Design a protein around this ligand. Sequence first.
Ligand SMILES: CCCOP(=O)(O)OC[C@H]1O[C@@H](n2cnc3c(N)ncnc32)[C@H](O)[C@@H]1O
Length: 638
Amino acid sequence: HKHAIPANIADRCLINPEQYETKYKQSINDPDTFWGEQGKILDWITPYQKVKNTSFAPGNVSIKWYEDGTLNLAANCLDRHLQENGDRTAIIWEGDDTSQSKHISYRELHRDVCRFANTLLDLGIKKGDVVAIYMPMVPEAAVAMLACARIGAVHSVIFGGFSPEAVAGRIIDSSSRLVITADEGVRAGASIPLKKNVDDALKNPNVTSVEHVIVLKRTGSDIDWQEGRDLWWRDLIEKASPEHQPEAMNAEDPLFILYTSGSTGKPKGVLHTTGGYLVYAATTFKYVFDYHPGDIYWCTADVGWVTGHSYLLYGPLACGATTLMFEGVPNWPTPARMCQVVDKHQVNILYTAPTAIRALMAEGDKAIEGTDRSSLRILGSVGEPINPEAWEWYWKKIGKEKCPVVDTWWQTETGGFMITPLPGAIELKAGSATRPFFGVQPALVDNEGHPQEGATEGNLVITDSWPGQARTLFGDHERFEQTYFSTFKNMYFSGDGARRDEDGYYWITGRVDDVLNVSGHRLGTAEIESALVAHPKIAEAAVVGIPHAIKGQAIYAYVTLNHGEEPSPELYAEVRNWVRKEIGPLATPDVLHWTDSLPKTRSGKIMRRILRKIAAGDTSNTLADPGVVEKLLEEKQA
Ligand SMILES: CCCOP(=O)(O)OC[C@H]1O[C@@H](n2cnc3c(N)ncnc32)[C@H](O)[C@@H]1O
């Protein structure tokens, strides 16, 4: 069943059903005219002439948009709003402790970004240098990111929940010259030891590139200090000039890297450039959230993830919006926190994740108790499939049956929304991402690469480029080709499956590759296997996901110990804590299945479908030793 577009949205919407159809058609039939005009959402220092210049061809994957144009992202997100909107709040910051908040005007944000841009330059950071940012959800994380972009440095934001080992790996791969961090993060009443984690990471002997660590005194806790290397945020910024002239960057200058888990190996740095990325971020934000001047917008995603890059910071600031940055979690101190934040700051647009929605739904009316929620006009969901029932609960309880829900499918590699409703254009189906965005040509293919027509299911590919597309993997364009453009030739393979219904609506069913989705976190099964195998007692490991009401998927690890070793309950917690140390809490296995019965072909291939099935609780429906299946079932029952 479809939800109709409500009258209030019809009355204000930037894109109606007719306009979506018209614009979508032009975007496909004439990308140069379409994106040529749409690119004017940004200010350009030297105008572009070329618009679309892309290829997905074998051996010739090359993605360029607006390539002869120049611009500055920070001028688009800050400077150009100053004359008329300097006094407008750019960032509302809400502390974990509600007694703590700030409204940061465009003018104040610009001033600090200029100070910090000069701070970076004075420290010897140059255009093209990579800067690691390992920060909690505080406004200074935004300042750091915007200052890096302003001077053309390439920020690489590392999610604050990653372990020292995970932080070291990212620093090593990117050759980061500087780490920006805080003494501690504050989340749900608890402290995260960020600087200490940096300290431990930098002790890795393979870290050779870091010259300084800039530290924000957030809590003022006791921390170790390395004289010469470590520098206090306040001491530097107070000394810095508030005057900084932005310089022209080429459209195709690198903007940021984000380490992203894949089907094979360890996370790789997904690279975005400047022009097409920002155009796409601004355009998707504006149209999908139907943003009007004055709308208070709140995306709940951490700055450490792509959603935080595109839809907490860059898209909203480019459009001159007020964006809310929340330090804490949607359910602390109480499940009603998210809606208390909504009421306190009169949020009109809320964009959150199914894991959060499921967590609040489990508490029922405790999630809305004593809250009003009337300021909301638009709801959004991102990061994982949303089951219809959760969708309906979100729509009914948070939106009060008054707000369109925009379920936005996309990925780190795509820069911005790819398949999504537009609230005044597209009638909603609970659990469906609905239609492709302007410039996006999706298709479904079988495992052999044959396009599947009509209402059908298959491997979800995108058959042409779009401005927000990631341009390479950091220092490895050949792997970029292999990973995304070799399975289905001349096509971008998302690694997701999807069904398309009779209306042409897409229903994304999840990864078809060996990538998990655990509480909205994208994780490779292979990286968890490597982390497990690095443990001195463990010989072999096979990791699969299982359905989980709360997390969406849980991590189920089949583990073979070195010959001579025997399991114990102490070993269970030891191995869990080991993975917590190797990667972080986000990757901790929910189940450890001690076995000597890993199911291998005669060649040595591990049969993963059976392990997936057994772990899910299936008892029904090539192997070197076929009697392993029986043993595995028995052990699963224990
Ligand atoms: C979009 C921000 C998260 O980016 P990441 O690159 O970390 O994760 C991308 C993957 O998350 C899932 N995913 C994301 N959005 C949806 C969605 N709306 N529905 C179903 N699955 C989704 C899809 O499987 C996708 O391949």
